[PDB]
Amino acid sequence: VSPPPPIADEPLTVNTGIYLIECYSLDDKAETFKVNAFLSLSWKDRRLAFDPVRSGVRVKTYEPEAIWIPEIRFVNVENARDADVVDISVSPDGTVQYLERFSARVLSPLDFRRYPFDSQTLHIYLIVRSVDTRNIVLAVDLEKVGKNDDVFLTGWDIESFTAVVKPANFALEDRLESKLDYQLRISRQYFSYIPNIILPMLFILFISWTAFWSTSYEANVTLVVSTLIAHIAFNILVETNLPKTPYMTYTGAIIFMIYLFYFVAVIEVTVQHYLKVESQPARAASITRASRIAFPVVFLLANIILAFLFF
Amino acid sequence: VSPPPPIADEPLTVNTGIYLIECYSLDDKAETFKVNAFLSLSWKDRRLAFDPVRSGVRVKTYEPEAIWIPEIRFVNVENARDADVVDISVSPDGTVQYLERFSARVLSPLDFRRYPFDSQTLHIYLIVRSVDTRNIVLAVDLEKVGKNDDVFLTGWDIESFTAVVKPANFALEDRLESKLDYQLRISRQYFSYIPNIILPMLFILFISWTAFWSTSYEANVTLVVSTLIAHIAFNILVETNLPKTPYMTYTGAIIFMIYLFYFVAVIEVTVQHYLKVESQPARAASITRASRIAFPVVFLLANIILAFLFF
Amino acid sequence: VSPPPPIADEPLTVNTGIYLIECYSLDDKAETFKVNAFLSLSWKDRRLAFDPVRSGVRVKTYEPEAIWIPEIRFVNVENARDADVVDISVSPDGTVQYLERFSARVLSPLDFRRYPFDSQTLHIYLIVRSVDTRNIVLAVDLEKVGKNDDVFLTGWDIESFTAVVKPANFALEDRLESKLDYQLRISRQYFSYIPNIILPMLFILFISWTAFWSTSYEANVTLVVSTLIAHIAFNILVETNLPKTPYMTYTGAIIFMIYLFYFVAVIEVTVQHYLKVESQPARAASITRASRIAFPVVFLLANIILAFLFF
Amino acid sequence: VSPPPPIADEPLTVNTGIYLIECYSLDDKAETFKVNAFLSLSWKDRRLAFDPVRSGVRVKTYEPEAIWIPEIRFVNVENARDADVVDISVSPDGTVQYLERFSARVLSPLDFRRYPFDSQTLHIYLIVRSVDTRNIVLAVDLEKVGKNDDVFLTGWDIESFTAVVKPANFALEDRLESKLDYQLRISRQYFSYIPNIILPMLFILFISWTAFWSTSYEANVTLVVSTLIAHIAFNILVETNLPKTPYMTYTGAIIFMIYLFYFVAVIEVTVQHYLKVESQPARAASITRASRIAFPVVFLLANIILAFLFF
Amino acid sequence: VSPPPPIADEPLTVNTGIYLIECYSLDDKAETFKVNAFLSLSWKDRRLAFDPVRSGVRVKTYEPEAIWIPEIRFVNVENARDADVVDISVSPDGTVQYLERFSARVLSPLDFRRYPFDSQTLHIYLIVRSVDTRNIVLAVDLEKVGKNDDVFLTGWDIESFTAVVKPANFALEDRLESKLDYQLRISRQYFSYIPNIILPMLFILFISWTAFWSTSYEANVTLVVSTLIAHIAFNILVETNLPKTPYMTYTGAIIFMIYLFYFVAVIEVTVQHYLKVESQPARAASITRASRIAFPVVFLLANIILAFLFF
Ligand SMILES: CCCCCCCCCCCCO[C@@H]1O[C@H](CO)[C@@H](O[C@H]2O[C@H](CO)[C@@H](O)[C@H](O)[C@H]2O)[C@H](O)[C@H]1O
Ligand SMILES: CC(C)c1cccc(C(C)C)c1O
Ligand SMILES: CC(C)c1cccc(C(C)C)c1O
Ligand SMILES: CC(C)c1cccc(C(C)C)c1O
């Protein structure tokens, strides 16, 4: 067993195809996802060709070890895929049709900039390293690229599974490498974030603003501080579900901005009390009266600015 | 070793049967469950048929590698099942009786809409890809589908383990695929949710309503804010045990609605104090007096509406 | 390699023995435990008979694949046991003495009703399915059932490791199955629960009762609410360490009952303040005075009732 | 392949040696540690002996399967070690020199009594079961017992890696077993516990004692209750990092004792207020004044007593 | 298969090269990282040499088992690497060119002193043990040491992947061991720590200092205690993400220092109230007025001192 030789001096074309059976475990923190799919391989090996009329058989079967099979590997995997050879069929002209069922944990980075309203493009990079006797080149058989209807990825919507038809051929350690890009397009199901994180977070912030309709320093301190602690809880909960990004995310920005509002509300609450003690409740009253309008307006304005910058 | 050829031009019928030995690890967040069961396979291979007379044995035992065995796979599995061939028996007419003991992590989505009062239908999809020489079709031998009496799935009740007798035959990459649906019907044991999450959650909310029988703003702010923090704790605890659904769940709805009650109670508490400071305790008194009846009534009404919409 | 044949028409007796080397990872939530032990098997295969004269050796040593070995499996395991064949010895008569060292994660349900003062009976079910040529029956060789003295299972006391001598023989999918029950009796080391969960929990509850010697509504609200939050913390901590049971557990009952005490204390605290504001401190004083006695008495009575019902 | 026969009737001496390459993952809760080391084995097999002069080769190398190798196993392991045979060398006299590189998860109990100022002795028990033809006995070749200089075990100091030279020979299931004890002496790096758990815990307790210089019941209730909640947090954090011991640990004792101080401080705070309301501030003043001295003195005394009892 | 013999009496040089394909899972607590890379090996084996003319081939391909391949192992790995032989090529002079693709979990300690502004040098130690017939020495072929452009390690910046050309040759258990050091230089992406941990932590501290512009003991106690609890939360969050170091880290120092500020602020708050009750508000006023300047100044000074000592 060694590579099929060239008729002229052409490279060996191995036609590929990935058909997704299962999608699961998209881990945001790890930036990984699990896949269960069919891997299809097709190439011509003339040494295997036969007569259809004389052989009586139109197709011949082979056990993996019996024939030369190209070493196709995945670039972005944690460990080498778990493969089960489903079938090897050889047609009269020496065209081989290989099929395996595999499962792998794919490493594909995610862009957290618009979280939880983000969309992603997951990648599966197929690769083949050229042998000394000949160069191996990959290609996409669009007929054998797909996914089953039931393929569901929890908390995400599956847009498309396509392959970039033109392989990226390059030199690596003094030998040719032919690389293919299979792309899984998904978009996050943001629904649940609204009643679980967004609205609770806004409610606790609005509750803090009731201190603008109270002259009790002791009650205000409780209002602002308490809600600030609940905000820290939400911040912590949110940051545990996400990886540490070198860029600012949409959620990150909002969560951060909100801290400034709690800080300024504390200052206001302190100022109001200070003036009151200092026997000037009229300045204190106008500062509070302003804040009543200022706080929601600046909050609403700031959010528009951020949504603009982010979307 | 290659498929048994057709007498006429009929497809090969493989008679299946799953007998559950163990059920465990139903992970709600992951929407997976672990299973340990017997897989039974039966098909006719005439090339193996014999005369009971001349041979002097009414059965024939084989090692897996010695005979042709159909490639039965599970659709909804994380990784290929762990199988141990228990026995392979051949009857005089060439009827093969295959038995294996397997364990697998099955991916089956759950409908969280009625959580924790929900019921589920877990699936085990058996599949067979047809060969070039012939088409393979699956069938259910009802005699070999079951579960042992001891099969317990922690915090769930096992209703039934049945199989949809008629397979779903379809084309996949120009070959025939025959798919069978084994269904495990279960219903959640909601008991524990009552004293652990439900009642504590209601108690903390009722405690918040004592602020309707108090004129102390400072005590009221403490009552409502404190309990709101305890509610956030319960919300967080609940949401960590569940996956992110694109739909509203029953518990989700309740938890969410309750936030509105805390928000409105804060408003009431603020209003009462504001009026009192503004030297009009009679308006404040009537608002408070109404709230004492309004809050429980609207809570009880809202819950009826929700239970109705959900069940 | 196929079963040894009967002299008369007797079933094959495979003697068994489990000798525990290691016990670890008793997971309460999962209701699983890990075991590392010796599995001993002994059956007569006359086909292996030999003359020590003609063969030199008094006992013959065989490699697993060389001889017929009965397929012994465990019923209540997650996955097939990790086995290492330690020795296979055949005496001249053909008596086979098989020894393997295995490790497995055993699934055995637990009765949480008396937690953390509960005792358990863990099971290891050995099984053998009968072949077509002959019936296989299991037996216990009491001489080969044990555990080493060092066998420690963290936070549990090991009472006994015994086997139910009489196997449970039954039909399963048209063949005989011989099942054996090995029983590991253990009892929980409740010590640590006293200073870690019990006493802290009682202290925080007693602290709440100081509100019965205070006329300050604002301090009382803080006392009762604060401690209630600390109780929720303990409840959550406790419930994370346990699986969701369809029955009430001893700890569960106590934790639940305590909520009622916090609820009633809030009511009392509210009533006392209401009456005081309403210019009737004498009724308030007598209600408080009774509560000081009522609360500890009813708590102590309720606990006796519960301990009675549970033990 | 079968055991080398005795010259006289002596047992087979297997010389052992463990050389630690990597030490990691000391899990306190699980009472396990991971090891990566060389396992050296040496015995005499006269059947393999040769002429030094006539052969012209000083030593001869073999493949595992070619020769008889004793079955050395570890007693206290989770699962059977991952071994790679590095080399097998036979000298002229028939002395076999075996070397393998292994990795295993060792189960070794820990004494938490002096945590986090404790020291431990981790064990690796080598074992060999005697064959029918002859008895196998283990020995330590001190020349081949060691560890590399870089061997670091995070948050622990490695004192020594030694072996108890005299094996423990005993009967187990009617055959001789020769057991060796390799001991890894380590001591915990307590440094970090000081600024992370100890000092914060003491600071929150001291903060609680400021209530002895305050006449405000409402502020005191806040001071004592708040800090008590922070103490519960530390207790919980500490207990999550440790297994449930049937004995009292040093930290456990301290954490527990501190609860009593919070309880008594609440009593004091209640008493002071009660007396003040009851128009007797002079008794209240002297009780508070005493507490100011009593609390730190009894704390300091109690700690000395405990440190004494524990070290 | 045995080592290629020396022409003179030279040691065998094995040229090495590591080309990183993937980098992931840098676990700070565990001090481990996962790698996926190509391992290249090249040595001269004269026994494999051939005349290009009588062969009609420029190269010769071999299956691992067919030829002698040196046993290269990694020193700092958890378990033996997962390797797939990609290719084995032999040039006419008997120069062997070996290529494998591997994945391993590398144990490499980290210096937490400047966290989260730290940089690290991860190591991959290649090792070879010398055989009896001859000594094996490792060498770096700089042409075959690299990483692909896509190599990303989440939350870290990859500076360089280089190899220390000169191997460290030494004796280990009477055999010569040749060790090579491959170094991955990385630096932490500190960005996210600023809005997630740093700024929130500073804000809660500044909020505590508003008590210097308040005469209300009850509000102050709330301000300082509340924020202290939020600080404990951040401390706990930070310490869970890091391993226990025997040295003080930069973050560790800051977190610790901040506790002292909370403690002193409580003292101030206590003193101010004490004096006020004791009818001397002028001393109290000047102490408070000083603190307003003292606290930020000493905080700013302390930080400069620390940043100096650490960077
Ligand atoms: C697997 C990981 C699991 C991680 C689990 C993490 C759990 C987090 C614990 C949350 C801490 C709650 O924080 C707590 O909330 C209440 C809100 O009523 C605050 O308290 C506020 O009102 C109370 C009650 O009147 C006062 O005692 C208090 O002084 C005041 O500041 C407490 O001061 C605060 O300490
Ligand atoms: C969590 C984060 C994404 C967020 C929080 C609160 C409010 C908003 C907008 C939609 C107003 C928001 O986008
Ligand atoms: C958790 C959620 C399911 C829930 C909480 C509180 C009350 C109710 C009804 C039964 C009143 C409820 O269904
Ligand atoms: C945790 C639970 C088991 C419990 C809590 C508090 C008190 C008691 C009895 C022993 C009084 C108790 O059994």
Ligand SMILES: CC(C)c1cccc(C(C)C)c1O
């Ligand atoms: C955590 C536990 C070990 C502890 C806490 C606080 C104080 C001390 C002594 C050293 C005073 C202590 O040993």
Ligand SMILES: CC(C)c1cccc(C(C)C)c1O
């Ligand atoms: C977390 C720790 C690294 C830290 C916290 C707060 C402030 C600072 C400096 C940059 C002022 C800091 O370095």
